[PDB]
Amino acid sequence: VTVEEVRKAQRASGPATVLAIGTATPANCVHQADYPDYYFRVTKSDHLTDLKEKFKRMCDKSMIRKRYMHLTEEFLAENPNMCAYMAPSLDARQDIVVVEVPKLGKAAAQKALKEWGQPRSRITHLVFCTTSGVDMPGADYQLTKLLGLRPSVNRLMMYQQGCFAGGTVLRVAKDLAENNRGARVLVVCSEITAVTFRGPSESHLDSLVGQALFGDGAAAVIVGADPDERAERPLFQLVSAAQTLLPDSEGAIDGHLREVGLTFHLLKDVPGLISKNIERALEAAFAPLGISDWNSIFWVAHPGGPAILDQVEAKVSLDKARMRATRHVLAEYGNMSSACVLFILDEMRKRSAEDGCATTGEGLDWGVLFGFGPGLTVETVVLHSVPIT
Amino acid sequence: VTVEEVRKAQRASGPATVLAIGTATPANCVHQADYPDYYFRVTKSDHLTDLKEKFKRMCDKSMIRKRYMHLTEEFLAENPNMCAYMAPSLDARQDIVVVEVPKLGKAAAQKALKEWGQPRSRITHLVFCTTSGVDMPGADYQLTKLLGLRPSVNRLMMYQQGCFAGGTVLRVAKDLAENNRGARVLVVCSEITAVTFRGPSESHLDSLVGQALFGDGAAAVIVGADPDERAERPLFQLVSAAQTLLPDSEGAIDGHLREVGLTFHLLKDVPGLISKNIERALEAAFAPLGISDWNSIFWVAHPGGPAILDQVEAKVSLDKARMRATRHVLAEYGNMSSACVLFILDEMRKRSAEDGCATTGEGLDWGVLFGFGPGLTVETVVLHSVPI
Ligand SMILES: CC(C)(COP(=O)(O)OP(=O)(O)OC[C@H]1O[C@@H](n2cnc3c(N)ncnc32)[C@H](O)[C@@H]1OP(=O)(O)O)[C@@H](O)C(=O)NCCC(=O)NCCS
Ligand SMILES: O=C1C[C@@H](c2ccc(O)cc2)Oc2cc(O)cc(O)c21
Ligand SMILES: O=C1C[C@@H](c2ccc(O)cc2)Oc2cc(O)cc(O)c21
């Protein structure tokens, strides 16, 4: 009868908890050892032998062993506008991603739901995040139909976000789960590089870097507060989430949706900008918790490129073991934009079980998740591990 | 310190409350009575006389007296591909809205921030919503710079949502404010029709209807729980928020971002689907609260078109006064997509104050806000007014 009464009956008690993770990728695998030859072949750029030597360096130094890509040679050969550096092609790219992004996210969400063990109808919110394609109704609507979620699911469609949004979706799901008693949030990031694939331009080497780094993939997490201990198995606790813009980082990471598709700009200051600011972000997150030793917490960081992990490592004097879960996902999947950190969370807890650690976070109790992206924005999520019996 | 201690010392206690509302439009104004001549002239389509008759009737029946459009005749004369029905023009349209959408948002945000009267640094969250254009970094980042908000403001960027997103942003802001002690959420919906404006085609009358209804505008709202009694002024309380998809509505409203810009497609009698279904949403939102008389609550409904309001009003036998503020915004502003319900909320609390109503909701205590859009999606936000 009163709003205060509704607010007490509404709202949950405990902190947002990750209850399941699942991941999926296209079946087409592309090995980095073959990509320089493959890429310069299908883009009819073999005559640019000087540029091809540069690409061989980037692919050799990428610390990427393989990527999964929906795009095939057979398809590209039928789509020369997408193989040119810059040709009319947004319509052709949209036709792929508008169908394939929700399709890939469905593959990931099914695995998360399966491990969750609860009926799909219990899912109350859906947070769908992509950086490839836009459409009305959005990919959130398509996924809802594909999975058969209830029609009254509360959907949040995060479009054209960039690579920091892996942390964004957890910050979003945290407030949804925590403010709504019983809420169970399905979170899906799904990325498909058909929107960004393009040929090589000697005058835009930062775009060439994108071609050596970005890959396809989707990851799904189910987040909820007040877990049913009898039926749900917690993995991580979401303690706090923050976003920030880095000083003097204007223009560091740009991306425009145009008739030639999604373009990509990237300054060489990106590794320096992140490494030089990461400690301010760590202090902001962990000082109120009383934590100052960055080697005593587990680490999840978006692997924008190997140079970012190298310079964050050196700047903060991390032990090589702390970036292992991050470097493994980079090596085995490449840069999947917003889905990366969720993949790393999945790899963190799996290895923690296989190795016999005390917790899902490599035996450590507290952890941090970092997303980096256009802004330059940095998303920081404090995590807490769960004991492994 | 445990994670439990954090949660307790992290959350707010009270309900999310609307503390300030500001609106803004482009200055360039077009009266509907003049638009068929203007629209057919600038699109070089005066020779399709039968189509023009159809478009007059579209405009006559729209119940819109005027709309604001950033696009001017001088600009359009230099952009023939945007005046054609179907010509490559995404790049030009993007070039417009990527700059003008946050600019119009700051005009409304500055009004709301002035009414709120608190320092801009106190803003902790920003929810920016637009259906006109996309970009990385987004319009939320542009607005942060233009307003001098703190670099650490938590931004949510809602792109390509559609007309129902005026309710979506309140549903987002509700959980941000309520779950974070001290959080003050700036909510900005900004819409500019340069992405959908296109010439007429005789085989695409659904697109032509959009040319009759859609206008430009931006609206800003500041949301927080636990208001300061001396320094802040509650206008409305967000009680609950829900989203649903209507049965048998597949494909009723589709919109595709293509190389010719944002196209618009209708397929399944939108006024019938909303009114056939509105009572279910009312009962879902208000049966837990013991209300069943849909005339006992104030109404804010997204004015997608007059037919939606007519059939919904007739389905639940609404007194003509319940739809008044909604129809006034439709008449003086057109269909401004996500921003419409925020304009109506402002009109309602102002008109309730101009006249001597007891509450900000036209003298009533409880209220309902509806967003309608692609899905068919219905957003339902239960409101509670504030005594004047
Ligand atoms: C690209 C990268 C993998 C190359 O590995 P490396 O061992 O550092 O080798 P280099 O530093 O010499 O870079 C290789 C070449 O690409 C170029 N390169 C690296 N970053 C570049 C950038 N933003 N723009 C243009 N060229 C770049 C270098 O100039 C170099 O060309 P060169 O042989 O003529 O000197 C590494 O620099 C890296 O990880 N950069 C981070 C990229 C990034 O910001 N990712 C975030 C994506 S949002
Ligand atoms: O090249 C390396 C680095 C190595 C490593 C990681 C962390 C650490 O602390 C020490 C060594 O792990 C790996 C594990 C692999 O399966 C394959 C590899 O190629 C590598
Ligand atoms: O640091 C590396 C190197 C990486 C790698 C191997 C081969 C290759 O061709 C490219 C990258 O594999 C890894 C695999 C891991 O599980 C953990 C790691 O730390 C690493």
Residue numbers in the entry:
A (entry chain A): 8 to 396
B (entry chain B): 8 to 395
Publication excerpt:
Chalcone synthase (CHS) and chalcone isomerase (CHI) catalyze the first two committed steps of the flavonoid pathway that plays a pivotal role in the growth and reproduction of land plants, including UV protection, pigmentation, symbiotic nitrogen fixation, and pathogen resistance. Based on the obtained X-ray crystal structures of CHS, CHI, and chalcone isomerase-like protein (CHIL) from the same monocotyledon, Panicum virgatum, along with the results of the steady-state kinetics, spectroscopic/thermodynamic analyses, intermolecular interactions, and their effect on each catalytic step are proposed. The production of these value-added products also offers the prospect of increasing the value of the crop, especially because many of these compounds are soluble and readily extracted. This study characterized the enzymes involved in the first two committed steps of the flavonoid pathway, CHS and CHI, and the non-catalytic protein CHIL. Through crystal structure, molecular docking, mutagenesis, kinetic analyses, ITC, and FRET analysis, our study provides evidence supporting a revised catalytic reaction mechanism for monocot CHS and CHI and identified an intermolecular interaction of CHS with both CHI and CHIL in a non-competitive manner.
The crystal lattice packing indicated that four molecules in the triclinic unit cell were composed of two closely associated homodimers. The two PvCHS subunits in each dimer established a dimer interface with 32 hydrogen bonds and 17 salt bridges, suggesting that PvCHS likely exists as a homodimer in a cellular environment. The electron density corresponding to an extended CoA molecule along a continuous tunnel piercing deeply into the PvCHS molecule was visible from an early refinement stage in only the A and C subunits. At the equivalent regions of the dimeric partners, the B and D subunits, the same tunnels were visible with only crystallographic waters near the active site. The overall structure of apo-form PvCHS was not altered significantly upon binding CoA molecules. The only noticeable difference between apo-form (B and D subunits) and CoA binary complex (A and C subunits) PvCHS was the conformation of a short loop, 271FHLLKD276 near the adenosyl and thiol groups of the bound CoA molecule, which appeared to stabilize the bent CoA confirmation described below. Especially, as observed in CHSs of euphyllophytes, the sidechain of Cys-170 displayed extra electron density and was fit with cysteine sulfinic acid, which indicates its enhanced nucleophilicity and susceptibility to oxidation. In addition to a bound CoA molecule, one naringenin molecule was visible in the concave pocket established at the interface between two PvCHS dimers in a stacked orientation of the A and C rings from each naringenin molecule.
